[PDB]
Enzyme design. Structure first.
Site, mmCIF file in Angstrom:
data_model
loop_
_atom_site.group_PDB
_atom_site.id
_atom_site.type_symbol
_atom_site.label_atom_id
_atom_site.label_comp_id
_atom_site.label_asym_id
_atom_site.label_seq_id
_atom_site.Cartn_x
_atom_site.Cartn_y
_atom_site.Cartn_z
ATOM 1 C CE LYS D 186 -3.032 3.230 1.153
ATOM 2 N NZ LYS D 186 -2.023 4.228 1.604
ATOM 3 N N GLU D 262 7.874 1.345 12.421
ATOM 4 C CA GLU D 262 8.986 2.293 12.311
ATOM 5 C C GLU D 262 8.359 3.685 12.285
ATOM 6 C CB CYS D 296 11.680 9.078 10.292
ATOM 7 S SG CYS D 296 12.981 8.127 9.477
ATOM 8 C CD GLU D 393 8.579 13.236 13.535
ATOM 9 O OE1 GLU D 393 7.558 12.575 13.815
ATOM 10 O OE2 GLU D 393 9.538 12.762 12.890
#
Lengths: 494, 494, 494, 494
Positions: D186, D262, D296, D393
Site C-alpha cells: 500500500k 517504524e 523521520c 515532531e
C-alpha cells in the site's frame, strides 16, 4: 533412583517478592491454593494488585538505571549468577519436586526426573549465553566505522502458565537474566508456591535487589496491569489464545511495548503405514497423555492410514486402558489429577460433546476417582474434521484418532487449522519423512519421536499459535534491542 | 539449447598477466599446449619463471599498499566488480566454452551447461559476500570495548589444477577478491588459455592494476617460486598429494605462510540392498565417469551389497558399454579424451596392473581411438581391498566394484583409507542413511546423489585429502586474518 | 584478600598421565625441576620419550573410537565436566597458586589473583561453548537438502610454554575438550608440576579414561615425537619461532596434520603527545615488566613522541628504579626471578650487547641478587632501529625507548618488523586512535591499555608471529573439521 | 554529472497492480495527485478499496501456494531476479529521478545522486542475502538430529510513507523478496506514481505473477483493510505514531499477525565544546534541513554547550539564511516545496506556536514563495524543554537550538523523551564519544556525522519510535519464521 518424597512439605513462601524482600499485598487480600490430588487448601497466598505491580515495576526500573550494580555487572558474572542459582535449585531438588507434585498434581517421578532436570538444563544453558551474544562490526560504505551493540530491552513483564510452573519460569528467567534485563513476573494463581520458593533461592544466590520481582496475582487484574504499565518495555505471555489477544491489544494501546506470545495448539500426529507399530503406538500414547494431556503441544489429532487403522486403534485402546491413575506420590502412578475444578468440568463437557457429535467412544469417558480431579483416559475413534473435539483444544486426557488415505490428503487436512505449534511424523522412508517435514506448517516437527524438548532447540508456533521463539539462541533476540553506532574515520582501508 | 560452437577458436592470450598488461617471459622461453582431441599444438604460451613470479608479487604488493585504490575501495564496490566480471564472462560464454573444450577435451555440452554455469554461479555468489562478512563486538570483562575486524590476509599465491580450469579459477578468485586480497595465480601447464582470457576479461571489468596477476608456468618451478616467496602471505594449492606436501614443506621453511591444501581422494560409493536400482546404477556411472573420471571426488570404490551385486554389476556393465566416446564437439559424444599423454599412459598402466592383480575385467580395458588420448570405459569386478587399483587414485575412466555383507563391515572398509574427500550412500531407509552419514569419515557425504556441488555448500576433505574448505562462508575464513581492538572506556554498562 | 601461602608445598604428581593412571617412563629416566627463587631441585619428574608418546597416542585414539563413552557423550555433559573441573581447580586454588609460584617464580599475589582467576574464567567460558557451536543448513540449488556438521578433528597434540603453565594449559584444554577432542599434551620441562596436578584433578572430575593425556618430556624429543606421529590429527604449538618452524616442517613431512602456531613477538608501544602522562607511564611499565618481561606480547619497543620524550623517560626511569625484586612469596615483592639459568644468561648477554651497541643505559643492567636468577629492571634510552635489542626478543625485564616525530613515520617504523603479535596506542584523540588502530599490522591492538586479555576476545598474531587464534569463538575453528551432508529430496520448497 | 532532466515526464502508471496486470478500482473511484512545486494536478490514480485489497491478497496467496513457481524457485534465482530489477531501475534512472522530483518536490540533484543510488544499493545488497541466510544444526541432547529451517512468513502487507517513496519501497521489497515472501504493498496517496512505475519494471524483470502487488489507496481505508485481513501473515508499517498504534491494535484484534513498526522521532543533536566548529555547524544544518526536514530521524533538538553557544548560533543562522529555495529542477536549488498543503499549514502553525511560546525567532518563520508549498528556513534559539516545539515532531524546516552546561545534564535531557529513533554526538575526545554513545538511548548513534545510512547497517528506534529493524541482516529476521525439525537417529556421536 528417585529419593523418598515428603508428601506434605511445609509452605512458607506465600507473599509478594519485591526488592529481594517479602511484602504483603497493599489491600491485604489473599487467595487460596488448592491441592488437586485431594481438593483441600494448601496455604494462603497474597493476591497481587495493580498497586503492587506498580511497586514492583518501580523497583525494577530503579535496579535497571544506568550505573546500577546490575548494569555495571560483567556478562560472565551474570552467567556465574545463573549457574549459582542452578546449583542452589539442584541442592533443594527433592523439596522442589515434592512441592511441584503437591501443587500441580503431576507424578512425583515425573517432577523429579523430567521437570526439574529440564529446569536445571535450561538455567545452565542460558548461563553460557551470558557472554557469548556478540554484536557485529558492519562494513558500511564510506570513511565510516559502524558496529552494533546488543543491549537489554529493559523491564520485562512475564506471565507464566500453570501446566509447567518451574519449567516455564526457567524458560522466562534464562534469556531475560542472561541478556541483562530485569524481570517483573506474574505467576499463575493455580501454582504459585514453587515460583515464590525459587524467588527466595534467587535472593539467596546473590542477585542485586530489584533484578527479579514476582507478584502472585489472582486473576487477569495483575496480568492486565503488567501489560498496560508504561515502564514495562516488553511483555511475554504464554497461555490461552483469548488472553493473549487481550494482552496484545492492551499492550498496543498502552505504550507499543514489544509483545511475545506462545499460545496453545491442536498439534496433529501422522502415522504412516510403514512406521514401526509398537514404537508409533507408544510414542502417540506418550504424546497425548503426557502431563495429563495438559501440554500446549499435545498430539490431540492422531492421523492413521487406513492400512493400519484397526491394529493401531486396538493397541492404543489397550495401552490407554492399562494406564494407572491415582495418588501422584505413589511410584506406580502414571497419571495424576487435573489442575483445578474448572479444567475438570471443561474436560468432562468436552467428552460429553464428543459423545454427542457421534464420535465412537473406545474407552474411558468418565470420572476416575470419587475424590480429587481424576479423569479416566478417554480415546475417541472415527473422528471427523467437522467435530468440535477435532477443532478445539480439549487440554485433557482425551485421544482422537482420525483416518486418512493419501499423503497429500493428510497434509491438506493437518495444515487446515489455525494452530501450527507442533506436528509429528512416524515412518521409515526417507522421502516421505523429508516431504512431510517440509510440507507441514508447524513450528516444530518431530520424526519418529515426540516432546523432544531441548534448551538448545528453539520452540515456537505458526499462525495464531504465537509469535517468536523461547528457546535456543533465537530466544535471546526477543530480550535484546540493537543499537547501531557509526563513527567517522579519517580514512577507511580494507 | 546449446549454441553452435566454433571448433577451432582463435587463441591470442598467451603471455604473462601482470599489472593489467601482458609481458613476455624474462628468459623469452615458451612452452606449447597440445589439443587432447587430436594431439596437435594449439599455440605457444610464455613459460613462467622465478623472476616473473617476483615481478608479479612486487606488483601485487604495490597494489596492496595502504591507501591504494584497491584498499580504499568499498566492499559493495568489490561485489559490483565481481558481478561485472561475471556479466563479462557470460557475454563470452560460447567462446569460453569452446576454448575450454579445445584445451581440456571435455564435451562441449558439458563445458557450456555445467562448467561455465558453475563459474558464473560461484562468481555471483562470492560477489554477495563482499559486504556481508561482519566482525564481532566482543563483550569482554572490565571497562573495555573490544571488537574484531576482518582484514585481508595479503598477497595470495594460488595454484589451480587442469581438470577444471575455469571452475577452479573461479573458486580461487571468488573469496580472495571478495575479502579484498590480491592474487598471484599460477595456472596448470596443460590448460593455460582460458585463464589468460579470463585475465583479459578481468582487465576489461575495471579491477585496479596489480590486483589480479596470472603467471603461466611450465612445471614445478613457478609453483615452488610462489610457495617460497617471502611476500606471499598465503598459498592455496589444489592437486596431487606429493606436490601438496612439497608445497607445504617449502612454505613452512620459507616464511611460515598460511597453507590451504585440497588434494585428491579415493571416495567410496555404497549401494544398499534397498536402494532404487535404476537410480543407483545411473548415479554410480555418472559419479565415476564424470569428466572422463578426472575428478578429485570420483567414486572409484563402489561398494554393493551381496544381495544386489549381480544385477548391479550387469546393469553397470551394460551402461558402461553404451557410453559414447569421440570428438567432444559432437553432440552425441559423452566422453572426451584424456588431458595429456602422461595421464593416458598412467591410466593404461593402471588398467594393466589391475588385470595382473587378478581383478575380473568386465568391459573396456584398452585404447578407444587410434588418434587422440581416448580410453574405453573400463569396469573391474570382484575387486579386493588389497589390490593396488583399490588403493591408488587411477584418475581415469576405470570402475571398481567391491562386495560387502554387513553395514558395520562396509563402514570399516570405507573408512580404512588415507583419503576422506567424499563419500556417497544410496538407500531408502532413514536410519541407515543417518547412521551412514554420521559414521563415514568423509568431508562431504551425498545421499541418493553424487557430485551435487553448490557454491553455498563448503567442500573439503579429511585425513590427507587436504585441509580447510573452499566453498560457502567457510571459504572466506582462509582468506581473512582477524584483528582485535580493545579500547578502555570511562564506564561500561550492559 | 590473598590467603596465607605454603612456601614449600608437597610435590607428588611427577609421572606420566595416561588413561587416568600414572605410569613411569619406559626408559625409567627422570629429569629434575629447579626452583628459580633459590636454584635448588624441587622434585624428580619422569622424562617423556617417543615410546611413552606412542602409548599416550594409542590410549587417546582408543578413547576417540566411534561409540566410545567420550564420543557418545552429550555436548551439555562435556560443558558440565568442564565446569566440574573448574570447580575442582577453584577448590584447590591456594595450593595451585603456591605450586605455580614455587615452580615458575612469579609473585604469589600475581599467581593467585591473575593466573588462576584467568584459568577459571577460561575453563568456565569454554564450558559454555560445548553445546552452542551450531552448524549450518545450506540452501543449495536444486531438490537437495544440504547441511554442515561440526565434528572433532581427532587426537590433538599440544605443546605449552613455561611462562604461563596453568594459563596456557587452560587455553589449550578449553576448546579441545569443548569441541569433543582428545588431548595428548606435552608440557615444558621447566614447569611440569602444575600440569600434572591439574591432570590428577581431571581424573577426579570424571573424564573418561584416555581423553586427557599428559607426557612430561625433557627436551625436543617428546615434542618432535608428538608432531611426527601419524595418529595425531592436529598439532598446536606455542613457543619460540625456530621450534615452531621445526614443528611445522616435521608435521608437513609426516602426515600433513593441521598445525596452529603462536610464536613470540616484538610488540611496539606508541605514546602520543596528547596522552595522559601518568596513565601512559604506568601502563608502559606494566606492559614491559609484567611477568618479569616473560610475556609473548611484551611491549619491548616504546615509541614516544619528541614532545614528551624527556618527561616520559624520567618518569619511566623513576618507576623502574622503585620496582621491588625479591622472594616471590613476600607480599611487597613485585618482580620474581627468571625461569631458569639459560634465560638469565641470555638476558645478561642481551643487556651487554645493548650496552655495546651504544644505547644509553638509564638504570639497572646487572644482577639483582647473589642467589637465584634475579635481574635488576633495565631501561635503555635513545634506542635506534638498527640496534640488535630493538629487533630481537630479549624476553626479559629490559625496557627500550625510541623517539619518533610524526605519526606516519611511527606507523612505518612499527610495522617494519617480522612480528605482529600485538601493539598499543596511548592518546586522547578519536581520529588518531582510529587511524593508528587501522594502520598497525598487529594481531591485537590496545588503546589506552595493555595486556587486557579476555577469554571472549580472540588472540593471535600476523606475519611470523603465528597463525590462527586461541581465544573466543575463533578458537573453536581450529579444533573442528566440517562435514557436509547433501540429501536428495522429492521436491524443494522455500 | 547529473543528466538533463525532463521537467514534465509522462505519467501512465496510474492503476492497481495485481497479478502482473493493471486493474481499475472495483468502485471506479480515482484520486488526484498534486505537484507540490506548483499545486497543479499531475494525473488521476485509481483509489484502492477493501475489495481491491482482497483481490490482491487472494492473488498473493495463490502465488504463495506450495509447489508454485515462486516457492520452488532457487534462492540464487531470487537474488538474480533482484539484481535484474536493480539493473532495470538503473536503466531508467533519469526518468525515475524526474518523476520522484515531480511528485515529491525534492531537488532533482538529490533524487538522482542520493535517493536512486540508495535504492540501487539496497536492492543489490538484499540480492546477495537471497542464498546466504543459513539455518542451524542444533546439537540437542540424546540420540536426535535437530536443525532449523528459515522459511518465508507468508503474505506481507507493507505500507510506505511519502517522504522517501522509492527508498522506502526498496527497503520493504528487499528483504521480503530475498526471503521468499509475497508482497501486497500500500503506497502513500501523496506519491503513488514512482511505486507504480517500479511495479511495471518488476513485471518486466520476470517475477512470477502475484509475487508483488501494489494497491494505491487514498486514505486509511486500504491500510486498515490490509492490516485487518486474515490472510496477511505479517504487516510492516512506517509512518506516524497514531496510525501505527491503530494498525497494531487492528492487527492484534484480527488474527494476531506479526507487526513491525517504524515511527517518527525527536532525535537530538549534541555539540561538545571541543568539536570542530565548521564541520559541526555544516553537519547540523544538513541533519535538520535534509529533505526539507521531512526525515523521520531529523535532528530537531540541537544541544550546544554554553561555551560555544553564541558562535554556533551565529554560524547556523548565517548558513540557514543562505539556503536556496526554489524550483527543484533548478541546479542551484537546495530546498524544494513541502509534500502537500496539510504539511504546509501544520508547519506554519508549529512556527506560530513556537513564536507564541517565547522562543527567540532567529531567521525565517514565513512563506518562501507565493506559489507552491515553500517555507523559509526557520531557526529557533533559546529553546526550553517545556516548549511544544521541543517535544512534538514538527516534520519541517524548523531548527531549535538548546543550551546545556554539563554532559550528565545533556544526557538526562536528551534521554528524557518518548522517542529514541536516532541521536548524534560531535566531539574530538575518545572518552566523551564512547560515554555519549553508550549512555544515549537511541536506536542509531552517529559520531561526527549524521544521516549516514547504509544498507548493511540496521536502522531502528527505541521506546515508541518503533520495533524491530529494517536494514542489514537484522532486517531478514522479521520476514522469516523458524521451523525446527528433530529426527531420531540410531546412535549419536560427536
Amino acid at each position: 533412583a528417585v529419593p523418598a518424597p515428603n508428601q506434605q512439605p511445609e509452605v512458607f513462601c506465600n507473599q509478594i517478592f519485591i526488592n529481594n524482600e517479602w511484602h504483603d499485598a497493599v489491600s491485604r487480600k489473599t487467595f487460596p491454593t488448592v491441592n488437586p490430588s485431594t481438593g483441600e487448601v494448601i496455604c494462603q497466598v497474597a493476591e497481587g494488585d495493580k498497586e503492587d505491580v506498580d511497586k514492583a515495576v518501580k523497583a525494577a526500573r530503579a535496579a535497571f538505571q544506568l550505573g546500577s550494580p546490575w548494569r555495571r555487572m560483567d556478562a560472565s558474572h551474570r552467567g556465574r549468577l545463573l549457574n549459582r542459582l542452578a546449583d542452589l535449585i539442584e541442592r533443594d531438588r527433592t523439596y522442589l519436586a515434592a512441592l511441584e507434585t503437591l501443587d500441580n498434581g503431576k507424578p512425583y517421578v515425573i517432577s523429579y526426573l523430567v521437570d526439574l532436570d529440564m529446569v536445571l538444563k535450561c538455567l545452565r544453558y542460558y548461563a553460557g549465553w551470558a557472554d557469548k551474544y556478540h554484536g557485529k562490526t558492519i562494513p558500511i560504505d564510506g570513511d565510516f566505522f559502524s558496529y552494533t551493540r546488543h543491549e537489554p530491552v529493559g523491564v520485562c513483564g512475564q506471565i507464566i502458565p500453570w501446566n509447567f510452573p518451574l519449567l516455564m519460569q526457567a524458560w522466562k528467567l534464562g534469556p531475560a537474566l542472561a541478556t541483562g534485563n530485569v524481570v517483573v513476573m506474574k505467576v499463575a494463581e493455580q501454582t504459585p508456591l514453587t515460583a515464590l520458593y525459587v524467588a527466595n533461592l534467587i535472593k539467596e544466590a546473590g542477585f542485586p535487589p530489584g533484578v527479579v520481582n514476582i507478584v502472585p496475582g489472582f486473576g487477569p487484574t495483575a496480568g492486565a496491569a503488567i501489560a498496560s504499565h508504561e515502564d514495562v518495555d516488553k511483555v511475554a505471555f504464554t497461555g490461552s489464545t483469548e488472553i493473549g489477544r487481550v494482552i496484545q491489544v492492551a499492550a498496543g494501546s498502552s505504550n507499543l511495548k514489544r509483545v511475545t506470545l506462545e499460545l496453545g495448539g491442536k498439534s496433529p500426529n501422522i502415522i504412516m503405514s510403514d512406521a514401526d507399530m509398537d514404537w508409533a503406538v507408544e510414542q502417540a500414547h506418550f504424546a497425548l497423555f503426557f502431563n495429563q494431556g495438559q501440554c500446549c503441544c499435545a498430539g490431540s489429532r492422531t492421523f492413521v492410514q487406513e492400512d493400519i487403522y484397526d491394529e493401531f486403534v486396538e493397541r492404543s485402546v489397550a495401552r490407554a486402558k492399562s494406564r494407572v491413575v491415582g495418588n501422584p506420590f505413589d511410584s506406580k502412578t502414571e497419571q495424576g489429577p487435573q489442575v483445578d475444578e474448572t479444567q475438570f468440568k471443561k474436560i468432562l463437557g468436552y467428552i460429553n460433546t464428543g459423545k454427542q457429535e457421534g464420535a465412537k467412544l473406545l474407552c474411558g469417558g468418565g470420572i476416575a476417582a470419587d475424590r480429587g480431579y481424576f479423569i479416566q483416559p478417554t480415546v475417541f475413534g472415527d473422528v471427523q474434521d467437522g467435530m468440535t473435539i477435532a477443532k478445539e483444544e480439549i487440554f485433557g486426557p482425551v485421544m482422537q484418532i482420525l483416518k486418512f488415505k493419501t499423503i497429500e490428503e493428510v497434509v491438506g487436512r493437518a495444515n487446515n487449522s489455525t494452530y501450527g505449534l507442533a506436528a509429528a511424523v512416524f515412518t521409515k522412508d526417507l522421502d516421505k519423512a523429508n516431504y512431510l517435514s517440509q510440507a507441514l506448517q508447524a513450528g516444530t516437527v518431530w520424526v519418529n519421536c515426540y516432546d523432544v524438548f531441548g534448551a538448545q532447540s528453539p520452540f515456537g508456533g505458526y499462525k495464531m499459535s504465537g509469535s517468536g521463539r523461547e528457546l535456543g539462541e533465537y530466544g535471546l533476540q526477543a530480550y535484546t534491542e540493537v543499537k547501531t553506532v557509526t563513527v567517522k574515520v579519517p580514512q577507511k582501508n580494507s
